[PDB]
């Protein structure tokens, strides 16, 4: 869990399976007893600890002396989802889909080719996977998020054509599989109720957007009262108007209303 992949990483790296090597396993670095020659007893926790903690820091470990990345920042996690949606669905495909959805309201699907349908489906699938992988860091950093990224939380879903679940739609059901066989290994951060946690994250981010708007308006009113003059900047007025329009538009697209 240390060397291979962390909490919010996207790369699936099985630490015990060396599927990325180009050579047979010659020397085992972390070995406690010579008896581990013909039986390393890997999989046991106390031995795999020594086996994995002796690995060098890779591009995801960010070693002790090397400066680490602010990965747990909402202002980084939201543009990451937006770039995922962009790489999934191209610009021309996005424009055509917007035109078709505005002209027929999900009735002109016959116009798109099968390749584009598969591109949209694969994009939704990859976006759901990335949301699953980023959910812990998101719910951790929701406290100090900023309004632009709070709105990008919905912008990215809309761009990926994924309607967020509220209590097309892709976060509505769980991945099928019996509980007696699922990977319930501790230490592997994997949520099991995604339609239940993404919904509460959406509700929390709507509440956070409302709080941020109220705080901004209250700060502006306090500054105006302290200045004792009705002099609002044109930049601030235009910004307030455009954000007030964009927020309600992109929340109504998903179905959530700001009240």
Partner 1 sequence: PRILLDRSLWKSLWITKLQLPDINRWERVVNSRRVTEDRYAFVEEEGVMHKVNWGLYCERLETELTVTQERLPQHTLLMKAVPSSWKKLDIDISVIRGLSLREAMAQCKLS
Partner 2 sequence: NALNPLTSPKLKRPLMTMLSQLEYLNSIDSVFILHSSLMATSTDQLVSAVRRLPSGKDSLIVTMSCLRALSVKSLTSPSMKERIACARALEIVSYELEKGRAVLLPFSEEILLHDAGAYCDEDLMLWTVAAFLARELPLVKVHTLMHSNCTARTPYRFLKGGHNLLVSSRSLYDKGAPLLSSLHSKELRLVTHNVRLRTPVRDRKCTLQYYNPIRARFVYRRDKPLFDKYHVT
Partner 3 sequence: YQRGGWSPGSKHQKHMTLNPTLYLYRFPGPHGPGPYTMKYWWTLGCFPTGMEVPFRLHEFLSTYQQEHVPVEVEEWLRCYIKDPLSELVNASNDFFKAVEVYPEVESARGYKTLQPSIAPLLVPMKKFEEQLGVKISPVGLRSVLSNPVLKDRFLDDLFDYKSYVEKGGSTPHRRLARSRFEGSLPAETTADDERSLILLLTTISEGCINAGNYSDAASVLADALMFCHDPDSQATTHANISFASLLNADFKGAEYNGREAALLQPQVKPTSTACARGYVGWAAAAAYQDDFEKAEAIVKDGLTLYVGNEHLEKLANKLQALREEQPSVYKQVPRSLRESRSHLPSQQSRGLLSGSGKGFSNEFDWVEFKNKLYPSKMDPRNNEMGSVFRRVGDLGSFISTSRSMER
Binding site for partner 1 (CB under 8 A): 10-12, 59, 67, 69, 71, 76, 80, 83-84, 87-88, 118, 122-123, 125-126, 128-130, 132-133, 174-175, 177, 182-184, 188, 190-192, 194
Residue in 189, 90, 171, 191 with CA at minimum distance from that of residue 127:
171
Instruction: Please state at what angle helix 147-159 crosses helix 194-227, rounded to 10 degrees.
Output: 140
If the CB atoms of residues 155 and 208 are measured against partner 1, the closer one turns out to be 155
Alpha-carbon distance of 246 to 172, in angstroms, equals: 25
> Are the C-beta atoms of 93 and 139 separated by less than 8 Å?
no
Tracing tokens 């581990």 back to the chain, one arrives at 36
Say how many C-beta atoms besides its own lie within 10 A of residue 184's C-beta. 10
- Give 23's DSSP letter: S
Alpha carbon separation from 151 to 67, 190, 194, 245 (Å, rounded): 30, 26, 20, 12
Binding track over 12-41 against partner 2, x by CB under 8 A:
------------------------------
Interaction mask 178-217, partner 3, x per CB under 8 A? ----------------------------------------
Q: What part of residues 38-77 is at the interface with partner 2 (CB under 8 A)?
A: 45-46, 48-50, 52-53, 61-62, 64-65, 67-73
Q: Compute the least distance from the CB of residue 228 to partner 3, in Å.
A: 19
Among residue numbers 54 through 83, which ones bind partner 3 (CB under 8 A)? 70, 75
CA–CA separation, 120 vs 133, rounded Å? 20
Supply 107's token pair: 């009735």
- Shortest Cβ distance from residue 122 to partner 2 (Å)? 26
Stretch 214-243: interaction string toward partner 2, x if CB under 8 A: ------------------------------
Binding mask 105-144 for partner 3 (x = CB under 8 A): ---------------------------------------x
109 interface partner picked from partner 2, partner 3, partner 1, none, CB below 5 to 8 A per type: none
Q: How far apart are CA 99 and CA 120, in angstroms?
A: 15
> Helices 147-159 and 74-88 sit at what angle, rounded to 10 degrees?
20
- The closest of 190, 194, 124, 131 to 165, measured between CA atoms, is 194
Distance CA 121, CA 115 (A): 10
| Binding footprint of partner 2 on the chain (CB under 8 A) | 1-2, 6-8, 45-46, 48-50, 52-53, 61-62, 64-65, 67-73, 136-137, 139-140, 142-144, 174, 179, 182, 184, 186-189, 192-193, 200-201, 203-204, 207
| Binding footprint of partner 3 on the chain (CB under 8 A) | 70, 75, 144, 146, 148-149, 233-235, 238-239
């Amino acid at each position: 869990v240390y060397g291979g992949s962390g909490r919010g990483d996207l790369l699936y790296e099985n630490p015990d399976a060396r599927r990325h090597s180009g050579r047979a396993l010659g020397v085992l670095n972390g070995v406690r007893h010579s008896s581990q020659a013909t039986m390393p007893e890997s999989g046991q926790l106390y031995y795999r600890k020594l086996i994995l903690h002796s690995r060098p820091p890779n591009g995801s470990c960010a070693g002790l002396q090397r400066h680490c990345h602010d990965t747990c920042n909402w202002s980084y996690l939201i543009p990451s989802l937006h770039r995922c949606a962009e790489s999934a669905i191209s610009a021309k495909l996005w424009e055509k889909m917007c035109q078709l959805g505005l002209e027929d309201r999900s009735k002109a699907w016959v116009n798109l080719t099968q390749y584009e349908r598969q591109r949209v489906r694969d994009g939704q699938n990859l976006y759901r996977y990335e949301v699953h992988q980023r959910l812990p860091l998101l719910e951790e950093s929701i406290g100090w998020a900023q309004l632009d990224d709070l709105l990008g939380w919905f912008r990215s879903a809309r761009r990926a054509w994924v309607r967020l679940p509220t209590s097309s739609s892709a976060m509505s059901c769980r991945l099928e599989g019996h509980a007696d066989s699922r990977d319930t290994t501790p230490g592997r951060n994997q949520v099991f109720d995604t339609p239940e946690r993404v919904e509460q994250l959406t509700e929390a981010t709507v509440h956070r957007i409302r709080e941020e708007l109220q705080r901004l308006n209250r700060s502006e009113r306090s500054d105006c009262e302290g200045s004792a003059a009705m002099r609002a900047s044109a930049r601030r007025l235009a910004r307030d108007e455009e954000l007030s329009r964009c927020v309600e538009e992109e929340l109504g697209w998903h179905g959530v209303a700001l009240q």
